[PDB]
Design an enzyme around this catalytic site. Structure first.
Site, mmCIF file in Angstrom:
data_model
loop_
_atom_site.group_PDB
_atom_site.id
_atom_site.type_symbol
_atom_site.label_atom_id
_atom_site.label_comp_id
_atom_site.label_asym_id
_atom_site.label_seq_id
_atom_site.Cartn_x
_atom_site.Cartn_y
_atom_site.Cartn_z
ATOM 1 N N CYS A 1 4.579 -1.094 -4.677
ATOM 2 C CA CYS A 1 5.041 -1.557 -3.363
ATOM 3 C C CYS A 1 5.840 -2.836 -3.388
ATOM 4 C CB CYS A 1 3.883 -1.751 -2.384
ATOM 5 S SG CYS A 1 2.328 -2.259 -3.094
ATOM 6 N N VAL B 1 9.278 -2.985 -1.152
ATOM 7 C CA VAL B 1 9.484 -3.881 -0.024
ATOM 8 C C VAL B 1 10.826 -4.607 -0.159
ATOM 9 C CG1 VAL B 1 8.778 -6.093 0.941
ATOM 10 C CG2 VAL B 1 7.076 -4.305 0.595
#
Ligand code: CFM
Ligand code: CLF
Ligand code: SF4
Ligand SMILES: [Ca+2]
Ligand SMILES: [Ca+2]
Lengths: 522, 476, 260, 522
Positions: A152, A156
């Site tokens: 992640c 992001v």
């Protein structure tokens, strides 16, 4: 104290009086623990229907999930290809955890690398990490292919995997022709199964997207088989066994059977078996493509139908009697191969086992959970067996899936007391087995804690766990089981009646009390 | 169906050699409920034709297996080689309350495990020694029985002398039963030998004894073996009716209960075949009258309760109506739920010496008709009682061979079959729902009102089970 | 390697003649083995731990060694006794079955013998017919007398032969008479379709030797009766007449007797 | 009382107050039951070492045997031949019981006939019964062969099977050329395994004794395999699989795998598969003959070495790692076929499993029983795993067997707290697990009663049953397992670690009491 010839581990060492009084002095003295009567009062409350309402009214808290994140599935997918190193672009913590999770389930080494992105790389992008890491991995571990997924942190900040790998190849970090398929696998989207779907489509794309013009459908006369996130070794094995038995030419796209089950012969094999690059490149030439776990292979299906021009059959997972029949008749249709006498007899033997055991299986209620396809096929088999799948929970399931499963349950009288819960967890399920107690739970190792809670309420409230699913950490070699085909159906059935009979023997083992029904023959 | 069953019989018999053909012919028939005498319709209790796969057991199975074996506080010794004892060890579900190995011994297997030298030299000295061993090792036993297996009967082992000398010495009741397997033609003679062993060695022990406090409402359940708790589910009704049930014959029975049975006012006989002998004896020696009853299903339980209560006073009769009313809501609930699920279904039965006619009413309370029924070892007096309970053009078969039963089932095509373990897996293979009517397929009770609930539940779970729709492959 | 079975009425001198015969046989240099299978008599006392007693002692037959059971006696005759229960109990028939089986399985018959002699008791059951099953005795000799119950016994035995004969290779080698009785037994044989292989005369020397645990051959080689047994032995060694007997009726028997 | 929607069967029906009260009135009023304090006193004494000396001093009484009679093994042997009807000469009670016994274990139909000898046939001999019986069986059930065994009653009276069958053929009851092999199988000698040996040898004799003149050893280039008394279907399957995997031509003599596992497809098949008559006739032409269960195939060995002239290899049962290696290499030696890559890898996977699970298996103490070969291979395996087979019981074992197993125990440090008991029964073993408590028992269904007794003494004294052997009547479909080969060794190993872990999870499921050791991963 310890006696040298009868050494005690944690259990039962701490049950000795010197430790039990020492522990009491730690509690009464410095823990400021709530009085036992308040601890028992709140426990009782967490058991009620009143607590259940509050529990299910949650919208922000998730307690004890029944799913993992995308990259895990991406790592497993990649391990299914010949000599490929799963590479996860992002923070290294993820990989350590992915590896540990899979080591504990398969009891084998799982090979995977990270390009260990630190605070500064979070701020500047992971372009340097991609350059060094691809170079370091290829030279040190020597794979024939590196399959890139993402954590992640890298999602992001929008690290363009395609650009980064293309720039890595242009600067001479890795050769231009070296296979480096990729897939953006955000942890905050779906789950581990979505990560497998994404990673598979990325590899299919890498090898076929540019090459489509010289491809002819059905020219290699095979059926591609896409397994999906599968953690029972017997499943890759039963599918390969049944197709070979029918004389069907096939290719299994993502096959980690060999790497996850190497022999302890004297040497460590980092890579073994797998789907070849050529099987991937030749894949559009297949008669068709069969997805074994369609509910988490949607993106793959879109690429195979849109890109390869294959007419993917509308087939459910081949678990249970009916869906195995359907799978076999469909593979028979496409291949032109008749279903042989060995398989015909194997089907009759599963039906035989069902007639032998129906008396104990009938009306037995179950709470179950797992991945969408798995839990869907578990529900159908339980229904074919005369059982009631009262609480069906699939944390990572969506609305269309709940619809399909409701359709399955509405077609049978055994599903008339069943409800399907998507987006709900094991703390939610803990309540359901307390308020609407079933006979057993069919789930992974995380349900051992629900069993301990029900038992704490009392013996007549105990709901025993039958370990089927992923992950199974507290038992050994169950990863070798089969869940698919008639073979998998036979294993599940045996496990169900014998769990019922083990439990009945316990309940009637009481001397002069309940042992009048402790029969020799059952 | 009237002449279609006679042509069926003849067609089935066509496969046998002539000698077997003429014998089996008279063992098969079609029912006519106007035939009070079954001997011009069917003969029974004759020997089995060799090599035709009979379903029958032996005299030992009848003695040890069904009559003596259930008696919980005695130690029953399978005297002879290791076989009989092992196969019959806890195969029959004759339930009991007790601490096994200490004061109860039903599920255990005590044998003399004969070797060659016991056959050649004889085993009376071994028996005597064995009896001393069960005494030091199982001090709380209240008696011992010696159940003869084939070899004991050939070799002429004088077991009654051993029983006499060891019994007087140890101050123990030791019963010798000459139930060697080759005697008779089935389990049936084994019942008889066992009943005789009971009267000759146990029943009259408390004869000159007046210590027991009698009541005008004292009764004994004779012939209920408590399969799955059948007898307990029967005596709950009898005792709620105001009666005092002093004895249970064999099912959860104790030796003292048997000794106390001559003290009662009435012998309630469930299993007519295995214990009518001891009942008849109790009538001529102690003056105790006996009557047959049926606790299978509501219509029969209600009828039975009324007949039994009519032998006593107005207070018992009043309590009888109290009990019928108490359970009326319950059994009507069962009928309301399961009968619509079972109506019009056809059943073929083949059991021992009582159930083939006894479970008929219970099946009919669920709307099911019995299209075929038969016994392994019944005598004509059981068949006499069978004619009233069966429908008109139905099949009747005594000591049915494996061949006959399979083919009769192939013609008739029943929706459900009720027989034993040796035929269970034959018909499930054939796609026909099967319920064990010996062991209740490890369920039970089936006796009384609470038993009816379980019976209906069971017929339904098996007949309307989802597996039966999946025997044939969709690709053939 | 000829296996022979000896049946007949015991009150005669069945065991004694069998032993005197085997002694004469061993005297001619023939290697013989005597197998006692008669609970109503002692079959080797004249030539010298039974199989059954030795077995029980060791646990079972499988634990038995052939050397524990076989013992050499006069003329090197090898002797084995089946053994059996004490009077009025047990089952001697099965004892015979067990013993013969043991001898088969323990390779006693494959040592290079010329003769095997089974001294059998009254065939009241299958066990005492163990000696005449296939691969056992092929020659049957019955010892008889002019007595009625003694000839009737000879017939019953013949009927038993007939039964196992139609099923296999076992024949009646003839009648041996232990003392016009001489003629009577000859006719009995002609009726049966066999012969009277030899007429053993009555001679007090047989008893003299018998009571002293010996056969005449050993007790007094020069005795005239000794030569009688040597005559029987030679007639047995050269015998070629093996037949399936034609039993007679008790009526036909009362006719034969009434004619003398 | 009964509530229509929650109907109770015997358990828990009788635990309801009105029944519990009625039962108490029956006891106090008419049973003259010994006071509970006395019942409790005698039980504790049956647990002591004092009671154990007495128990072991028995010489006439047998309580709870761990064996059956000869004819039972004979029926099983005969079922392994193509379209043959096992026929038992003697009384019928025996047959009803044989059939029932095998029905309950295999959950399948078992076909067998008797000639129903009654009291007059006991007095006259069973010759007439044999004539009519053979005629009726052939005409009705139509087998290609009838294999005759016997019950004790027929053995006592000396019914000559050979004469009776020959007279049957002679009088025209059955054709002269119709195969009718026979074997005298006395109940009072040996056990069920001896019955198998006698019957196999009787059939071998029947088909080869007369025909030996035209036989040449090694001319058909196959290896005969004689299985012995085997009730695990997977054992027939694994041996056939491993040999085919090696390319080894073989002939399995007595193969009941198909009859004992027909399909529920709508029809009943009385006969299925089996060793053909020609495979038995052609058997002396084989290269050699391997007996899988040598300790109960002694009469067969003598006929194979004596008549067939084959040099039967001194090989133990192929259970565990070493004996499976020895079996494969001997089979390799004899056939000339090398041990393939597939089997080599399978071996390493079992070793892998052993290295993964050794931690939980080490020093674990076991009480076990069964037939001599099974129990001997089990001891050996347990020993390879680092386990201690403390109590080894083989009711039907002999003195030479005990020597052999003591020799095996002597060869390893794990067999030093071990003792072998022959001729002892489960009541003897009941004492052994009370006075010298092991962790688990590995045996058949009869040991569920020993577990019940140990639990009555207390939870700490409870010794759990791991169901491996024959017969298993209280669990379903265990008869489908494998005990032989690496495959069987992997199954056995999983069952043992998981029984250990199951038990640990049970002892650690106490909330705030013992659950500090209720670990997710084990
Ligand atoms: S087969 Fe009863 S006369 Fe007897 S064991 Fe069953 S139909 Fe018996 S009711 Fe009974 S409890 Fe029975 S079911 Fe008479 S005792 S020899 Mo096999
Ligand atoms: S009718 Fe002898 S050991 Fe026991 S099973 Fe037999 S072969 Fe075996 Fe009835 S009394 Fe018993 S079961 Fe007589 S022998 Fe059969
Ligand atoms: S007559 Fe024969 S088989 Fe019968 S008991 Fe006597 S010796 Fe044994
Ligand atoms: Ca591993
Ligand atoms: Ca089955």
């Amino acid at each position: 104290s310890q006696q040298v010839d009868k050494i005690k581990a944690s259990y039962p060492l701490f049950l000795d009086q010197d430790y039990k009084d020492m522990l009491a002095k730690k509690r009464d003295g410095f823990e400021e623990k709530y009085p036992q009567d308040k601890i028992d009062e709140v426990f009782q409350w967490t058991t009620t229907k009143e607590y259940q309402e509050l529990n299910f009214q949650r919208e922000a808290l998730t307690v004890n999930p029944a799913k993992a994140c995308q990259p895990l599935g991406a790592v497993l997918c990649a391990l299914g290809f010949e000599k490929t190193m799963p590479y996860v672009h992002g923070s290294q913590g993820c990989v350590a955890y992915f590896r540990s999770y899979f080591n504990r389930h398969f009891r084998e080494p799982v090979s995977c690398v990270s390009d260990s992105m630190t605070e500064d790389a979070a701020v500047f992008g992971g372009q340097q990490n991609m350059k060094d890491g691809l170079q370091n991995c290829k030279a040190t571990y020597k794979p024939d292919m590196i399959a890139v997924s993402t954590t992640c942190m890298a999602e992001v900040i929008g690290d363009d995997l395609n650009a980064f790998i293309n720039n890595s190849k242009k600067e001479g970090f890795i050769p231009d022709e070296f296979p480096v398929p990729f897939a953006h696998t955000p942890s905050f989207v779906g789950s581990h199964v979505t990560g497998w779907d994404n990673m598979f489509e990325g590899i299919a794309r890498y090898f076929t997207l540019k090459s489509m013009d010289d491809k002819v459908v059905g020219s290699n006369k095979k059926i591609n088989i896409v397994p999906g996130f599968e953690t029972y070794l017997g499943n890759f094995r039963v599918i390969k066994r049944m197709l070979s038995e029918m004389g069907v030419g096939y290719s299994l796209l993502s096959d980690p059977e060999e790497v996850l089950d190497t022999p302890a012969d004297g040497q460590f094999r980092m890579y073994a078996g797998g789907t070849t690059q050529e099987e991937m490149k030749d894949a559009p030439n297949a008669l068709n493509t069969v997805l074994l776990q369609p509910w988490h292979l949607e993106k793959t299906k879109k690429f195979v139908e849109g890109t390869w021009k294959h007419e993917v059959p509308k087939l459910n997972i081949p678990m249970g009697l009916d869906w195995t029949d359907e799978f076999l008749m469909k593979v028979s249709e496409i291949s032109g191969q008749p279903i042989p006498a060995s398989l015909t007899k194997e089907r009759g033997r599963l039906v035989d086992m069902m007639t032998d055991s129906h008396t104990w299986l009938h009306g037995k209620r179950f709470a179950l959970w797992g991945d969408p396809d798995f839990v869907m096929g578990l529900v159908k088999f339980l229904l074919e067996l005369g059982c009631e799948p009262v609480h069906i929970l699939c944390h990572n399931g969506n609305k269309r899936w709940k619809k399909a499963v409701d359709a399955i349950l509405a077609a049978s009288p055994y599903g008339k007391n069943a409800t399907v819960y998507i987006g709900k967890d094991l703390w939610h399920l803990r309540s359901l087995v307390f308020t609407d107690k079933p006979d057993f739970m069919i789930g992974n190792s995380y349900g051992k804690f629900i069993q301990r809670d029900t038992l704490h309420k009392g013996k007549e409230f105990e709901v025993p766990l039958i370990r089927i699913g992923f992950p199974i950490f507290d038992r050994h070699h169950l990863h070798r089981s089969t869940t698919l085909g008639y073979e998998g159906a036979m294993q599940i059935l045996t496990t169900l009646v014998n769990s019922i009979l083990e439990r009945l023997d316990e309940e009637t083992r009481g001397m002069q009390a309940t042992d009048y029904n402790h029969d020799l023959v059952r | 169906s009237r002449e279609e069953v006679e042509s069926l019989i003849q067609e089935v018999l066509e496969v046998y050699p002539e000698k077997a053909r003429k014998d089996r012919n008279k063992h098969l028939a079609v029912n006519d409920p106007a035939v009070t005498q079954s001997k011009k319709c069917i003969i029974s209790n004759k020997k089995s034709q060799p090599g035709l796969m009979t379903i029958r057991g032996c005299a030992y199975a009848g003695s040890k297996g069904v009559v003596w074996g259930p008696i919980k506080d005695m130690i029953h010794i399978s005297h002879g080689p290791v076989g009989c004892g092992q196969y019959s060890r806890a195969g029959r579900r004759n339930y009991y309350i007790g601490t096994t190995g200490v004061n109860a011994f039903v599920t255990m297997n005590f044998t003399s495990d004969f070797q060659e030298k016991d056959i050649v030299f004889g085993g009376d000295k071994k028996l005597a020694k064995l009896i001393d061993e069960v005494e030091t090792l199982f001090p709380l036993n209240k008696g011992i029985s010696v159940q003869s297996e084939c070899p004991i009967g050939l070799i002429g082992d004088d077991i009654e002398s051993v029983s006499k000398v060891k019994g007087a010495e140890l101050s123990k009741t030791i019963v010798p039963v000459r139930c060697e397997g080759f005697r008779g033609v089935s389990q049936s003679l084994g019942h008889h030998i066992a009943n005789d062993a009971v009267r000759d060695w146990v029943l009259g022990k408390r004869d000159e004894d007046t210590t027991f406090a009698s009541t005008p409402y004292d009764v004994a359940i004779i012939g209920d073996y408590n399969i799955g708790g059948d007898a307990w589910s029967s005596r709950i009704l009898l005792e709620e009716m105001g009666l005092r049930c002093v004895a249970q014959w064999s099912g959860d029975g104790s030796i003292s209960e048997i000794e106390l049975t001559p003290k009662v006012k009435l012998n309630l006989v469930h299993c007519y075949r295995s214990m009518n002998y001891i009942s008849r004896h109790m009538e001529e020696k102690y003056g105790i009258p006996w009557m047959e009853y049926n606790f299978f299903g509501p219509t029969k339980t209600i009828e039975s309760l009324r007949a039994i209560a009519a032998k006593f006073d107005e207070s018992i009769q009043k309590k009888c109506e109290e009990v019928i009313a108490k359970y009326k809501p319950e059994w009507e609930a069962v009928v309301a739920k399961y009968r619509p699920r079972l109506e019009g279904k056809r059943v073929m039965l083949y059991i021992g010496g009582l159930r083939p006619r006894h479970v008929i009413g219970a099946y009919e309370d669920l709307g099911m008709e019995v299209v075929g029924t038969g016994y392994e070892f019944a005598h004509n007096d059981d068949y006499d009682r069978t004619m009233k309970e069966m429908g008109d053009s139905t099949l009747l078969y005594d000591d049915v061979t494996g061949y006959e039963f399979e083919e009769f089932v192939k013609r008739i095509k029943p929706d459900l079959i009720g027989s034993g373990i040796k035929e269970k897996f034959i018909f499930q293979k054939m796609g026909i729902p099967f319920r064990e009517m010996h062991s209740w397929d490890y369920s039970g009770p089936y006796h009384g009102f609470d038993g009816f609930a379980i019976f209906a539940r069971d017929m339904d779970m098996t007949l309307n089970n989802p597996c039966w729709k999946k025997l044939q492959a969709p690709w053939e | 390697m000829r296996q022979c079975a000896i049946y007949g009425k015991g009150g005669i001198g069945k065991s004694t003649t069998t032993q005197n015969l085997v002694a004469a046989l061993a005297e001619m240099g023939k290697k013989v083995m005597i197998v006692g299978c008669d609970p109503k008599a002692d079959s080797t006392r004249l030539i010298l731990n039974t199989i059954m007693e030795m077995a029980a002692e060791a646990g079972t037959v499988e634990d038995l060694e052939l050397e524990d059971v076989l013992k050499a006696g006069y003329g090197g005759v090898k002797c084995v006794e089946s053994g059996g229960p004490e009077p009025g109990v047990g089952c001697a028939g099965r004892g015979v079955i067990t013993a013969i089986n043991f001898l088969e399985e323990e390779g006693a018959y494959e040592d290079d013998l010329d003769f095997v002699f089974y001294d059998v008791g009254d065939v009241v059951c299958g066990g005492f017919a163990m000696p005449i099953r296939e691969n056992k005795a092929q020659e049957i000799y019955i010892v008889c007398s002019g007595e009625m119950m003694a000839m009737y016994a000879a017939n019953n035995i013949s009927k038993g032969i007939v039964k196992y004969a139609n099923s296999g290779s076992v024949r009646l080698g003839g009648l041996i008479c232990n003392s016009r009785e001489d003629e009577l037994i000859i006719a009995l044989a002609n009726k049966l379709g066999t012969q009277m292989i030899h007429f053993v005369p009555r001679d007090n020397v047989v008893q003299r030797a018998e009571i002293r645990r010996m056969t005449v051959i050993e007790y007094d080689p020069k005795a005239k009766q000794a030569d009688e047994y040597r005559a029987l032995a030679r007639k047995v060694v050269d015998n070629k007449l093996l037949v399936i007997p034609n039993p007679i009726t008790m009526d036909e028997l009362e006719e034969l007797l009434m004619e003398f």
